[PDB]
């Protein structure tokens, strides 16, 4: 059982007669056995749902579901009620109609009554627009796969009870909906399926006396599970071989499922569409979870748009895979619908840790601490995701030093001492560069021939420790900072477009410091790259770096790292 609507509307007037028919109600069937019973409420609710006075006036007939005035209305009753209205002009009371607290469909249906201070007027003041249909248009509600029944009736009952001398006719326009002759109930021919069509917006023809009036007529077909899951037209298996990524959680391989139902809604979709991992080795549990989340799409059937659910199924890892794993499997998953079979092929490969045979690098002979010379990298640099290849620099004069930046798993080598650089007998050295792993002991080494080469000019005594304490261009390349590669600094200057990310400063490494990353070499000291590694106040119109630093700043930005301040100012 369910009502064909949820809200019913009716008008009451002063001094109308007893036994006057107000309206019918309608209730369709879920089954070939259900007969509707109708009971009223007892207390008229009002605006902000508060009981005003007990229904002493409206009675019901359970057989056809007829609402009719038993006792009648007067101004003493509509001052008895309108004072109880908490101070509002009364234009809406209502009751509940149950058939099997708070009124909600498909149990209840709330029936409004809009009262007016006049009596029921004469027939001459009835325009045919208020003679056919009520003002608030209905909206109907039919579940699919149901016994066909009767869901609407046309006639305005107090109208023909009080103006019977005007003939009014009603009709409907391969459609399942028909209007019976000489009995104005509307009925359904065959049981509907939503998946063919889901919205029927019909037009009902009314003719008074003489005026022809038509109104919209919405019917929304509801839904059930009348559909089983299906491959998207013969794509039965996708596969993917783990080669390089090996991180914690990564989308590896993916398939799709096309259900045509909507009914397993967002609250309880997780109970029904469940991804049963078919078992195998416990390495599959240790390393795989089959993640799943749905999304609704639309598809055409016979000129309309019926919607459906798409269930994506993705292999996602669980842990850092080690390097030396070399296996293959068949990962099967059952999919439930309340039943489909999917699987994956997964192979895991070994990876070697080879490095180039000979590294070759010059060093500027006047260089300072923490200067980046050149990058050292395992042969496949930016493709790995979850491998710790830490680099250590073993010699066979300590001048250089390697610390691997964790973002790229590349080792950047930097100069750690300056006094041990200018020595004449150590003008050529041997740094066996060693690239070790951490989840396996598998390391590597490679050969280097360093040539420390350049001039030598001693520095000025009026130099601060940082390049970025400077303000203008000429005080940048005459004075040395801390992380400088050739003893000088370098001035970068941008545009005059306001607060821009491309601003002006004096930097040691114009490609490494004002870059967006506070590198490990950059975060070594407070003085090397302060305008991208500081934790301080930036006086002036700025916009902060998102971990730290200066993302953008109005004009020139000069920073005091010993006092933890920046000024951004033109």
């Amino acid at each position: 059982l369910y009502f064909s609507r949820d809200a019913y509307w009716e008008k009451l007037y002063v001094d109308q007669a007893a036994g006057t028919p107000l309206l019918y109600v309608h209730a369709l069937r879920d089954a070939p056995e259900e007969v509707p019973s109708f009971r009223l409420g007892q207390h008229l609710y009002g605006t902000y749902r508060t009981r005003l006075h007990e229904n002493n006036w409206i009675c019901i007939q359970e057989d056809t579901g007829l609402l009719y005035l038993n006792r009648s209305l007067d101004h003493s009753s509509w001052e008895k009620l309108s004072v109880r209205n908490h101070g509002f002009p009364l234009l809406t009371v209502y009751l509940k109609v149950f058939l099997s607290g708070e009124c909600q469909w498909p149990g209840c249906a709330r029936v409004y009554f809009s009262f007016f201070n006049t009596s029921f007027p004469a027939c001459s003041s009835l325009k045919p627009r208020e003679l056919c249909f009520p003002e608030t248009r209905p909206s109907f509600r039919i579940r699919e796969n149901r016994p066909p029944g009767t869901f609407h009736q046309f006639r305005l009952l107090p109208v023909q009870f009080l103006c019977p001398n005007i003939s009014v006719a009603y009709r409907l326009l391969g459609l399942p909906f028909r209007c019976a002759p000489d009995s104005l109930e509307v009925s359904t021919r065959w049981a509907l399926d939503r998946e063919q069509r889901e919205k029927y917006e019909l037009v009902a023809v009314c003719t008074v006396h003489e005026e022809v009036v038509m109104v919209p007529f919405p019917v929304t077909v509801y839904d059930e599970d009348d559909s089983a899951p299906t491959f998207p037209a013969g794509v039965d298996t996708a596969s993917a071989v783990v080669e390089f990524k090996r991180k914690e959680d990564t989308v590896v391989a993916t398939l799709r499922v096309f259900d045509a139902d909507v009914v397993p809604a967002s609250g309880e979709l997780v109970r029904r569409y469940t991804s049963t991992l078919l078992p195998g080795d416990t390495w599959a549990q240790q390393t795989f979870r089959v993640e799943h989340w749905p999304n609704e799409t639309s598809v055409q059937a016979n000129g309309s748009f019926v919607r459906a659910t798409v269930h994506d199924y993705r292999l996602v890892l669980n842990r850092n895979l080690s390097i030396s794993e070399n296996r293959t499997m068949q990962l099967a998953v059952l999919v439930n619908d309340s039943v489909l079979l999917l699987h994956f092929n997964v192979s895991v490969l070994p990876v070697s840790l080879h490095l180039p045979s000979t590294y070759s690098l010059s060093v500027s002979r006047r260089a300072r601490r923490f200067a980046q010379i050149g990058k050292v990298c395992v042969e496949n640099c930016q493709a790995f995701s979850g491998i710790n290849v830490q680099y250590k620099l073993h010699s066979s004069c300590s001048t250089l030093g390697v610390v691997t930046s964790a973002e790229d798993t590349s080792g950047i080598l930097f100069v750690n001492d300056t006094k041990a650089l200018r020595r004449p007998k150590c003008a050529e050295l041997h740094y066996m560069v060693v690239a070790t792993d951490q989840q396996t002991s598998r390391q590597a080494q490679a050969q280097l021939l360093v040539t420390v080469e350049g001039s030598y000019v001693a520095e000025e005594a009026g130099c601060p420790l940082s390049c970025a304490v400077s303000k203008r261009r000429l005080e940048c390349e005459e004075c040395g900072g801390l992380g400088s590669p050739t003893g000088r600094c370098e001035w970068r200057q941008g545009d005059g477009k306001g607060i821009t990310r491309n601003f002006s400063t004096c930097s040691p490494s114009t490609k490494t410091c004002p870059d967006g990353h506070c590198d490990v070499v950059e975060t070594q000291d407070i003085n090397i790259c302060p305008q991208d590694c500081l934790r301080g106040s930036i006086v002036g119109g700025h916009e902060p770096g998102e971990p730290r630093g200066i993302k953008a700043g109005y004009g020139t930005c000069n920073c005091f790292p010993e006092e933890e301040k920046c000024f951004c100012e033109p």
Binding site: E135, T136, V263
Partner: protein, 199 residues
């Protein structure tokens, strides 16, 4: 200089209103913005201020082609921090309103005083107590905002995509914002007064 700036400076020039507008301009700024402090200073603004100061600040007139007068008006309640980034299901957004007993009190008054009574535009009680129930919804979880920047169509930031079978219970709840005759004629009566007041 347009009208949505003239009615903003009249809240600036007040002592009582600029002190409140500074309280949510600060909590709704920058990329590191925090949402539940940004919303709490909006209820305080549209609650503890004079009604001609709030109603002129939010609901402000414009032309259809006047881009910098509707683009500001969409961004007055700071939607990049107040409205969530992902659009949730529009029945789920009502659930969080029903849980907190302030949003429930602010929502029941709007379902009371701005119910679509007639399809011509006639409201239930008054077209003056409609906006008082309307503006009480701004700092809550069901914050409405102007969708476009060329017209005064206003809706929630929600979608009825993953509704399941409650499509009409979601379509009517959105049609209570984008298909209200009452609320649209109320906001139109207020904008036709604001284009009479200091125009």
């Amino acid at each position: 200089s347009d009208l949505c700036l003239k009615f903003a400076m009249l809240c600036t020039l007040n002592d009582k209103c600029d002190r409140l507008r500074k309280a949510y301009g600060e909590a709704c700024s920058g990329p590191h913005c925090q949402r539940h402090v940004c919303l709490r200073q909006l209820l305080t603004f549209f609650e503890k201020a004079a009604e001609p100061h709030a109603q002129g600040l939010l609901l402000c007139p414009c032309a259809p082609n006047d881009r910098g007068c509707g683009e500001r008006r969409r961004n007055t309640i700071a939607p990049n921090c107040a409205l969530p980034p992902v659009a949730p299901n529009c029945l789920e957004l009502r659930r969080l309103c029903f849980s907190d007993p302030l949003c429930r009190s602010r929502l029941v008054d709007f379902q009371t005083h701005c119910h679509p009574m007639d399809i011509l535009g006639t409201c239930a009680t008054e077209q003056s107590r409609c906006l008082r129930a309307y503006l009480g919804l701004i700092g809550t979880a069901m914050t409405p905002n102007f969708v476009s920047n060329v017209n005064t169509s206003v809706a929630l930031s929600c979608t009825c995509r993953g509704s399941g079978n409650l499509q009409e219970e979601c379509e009517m709840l959105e049609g209570f914002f984008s298909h209200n005759p009452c609320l649209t004629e109320a906001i139109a009566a207020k904008m036709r007064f604001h284009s009479q007041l200091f125009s």
